[PDB]
Amino acid sequence: TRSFYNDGHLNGWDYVRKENQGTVSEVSNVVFKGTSALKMTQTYTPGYTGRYHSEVDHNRGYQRGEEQFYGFAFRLSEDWQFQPQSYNIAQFIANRPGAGCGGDDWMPSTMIWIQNNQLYSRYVNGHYRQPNCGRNIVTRPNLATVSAGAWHRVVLQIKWASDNTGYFKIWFDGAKVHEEYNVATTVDDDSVFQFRVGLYANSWHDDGHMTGTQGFRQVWYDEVAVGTTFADVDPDQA
Ligand SMILES: [Ca+2]
């Protein structure tokens, strides 16, 4: 059964983040299903020292000790300029105030991004809380080649565990592209992580510069769902 469904509208998201010159809007011309989708844009601005999130938030993403499925459709601009930097397209993230690790208390766990023409993801495990900030980031590269100007469909099946009892499975355009079992997929606490979808141009800030010449970046989203079965969240079926 689905706990969340969004057909490509502003309505139903808890929060809309349009950092700096970013936009998030509803469009009817570039749509995966129905008559609406969301368009996220970000624009590089030399001098700016802040971050570049254009995202919509579903606050109830996960809590450790459950299995969930997540599905969404996304599309890069047809003229997407593939570059080695990261452009993040979805993430799970919790605010963990008082954890005392790193530069603030927001910790993204699993993230999904484009690097060159490849879909990357990761999960995080460990403790990341004083007096032990020990945490491990497992990156899973090259999950799929991503074509520009086409709707792609992503399904995740994740059992969120800090034990070696979790699992982490990903489908891309209807095909299983990754699965691994008996792994720890989140940190060992009970924070509730948000599920965000949207263009987060993280390398622009992290790296101190932009690689290439496409400072105006566009990604569309549609058909986002959270539920307990594959069919609940698969954008490619009802
Ligand atoms: Ca739609």
UniProtKB/TrEMBL annotation:
Ca(2+) binds at D7, K33, S36, D222. The lineage of its organism: Eukaryota, Fungi, Dikarya, Ascomycota, Pezizomycotina. Keywords: Calcium, Lyase, Metal-binding, Signal. The keyword Translocase does not apply. Disulfide bonds join C101-C133. The keyword Metal-binding applies. It comes from Hypocrea jecorina (Trichoderma reesei). GO terms for molecular function: lyase activity; metal ion binding. Pfam families: Polysacc_lyase (PF14099). The gene is glA. This is Glucuronan lyase A.
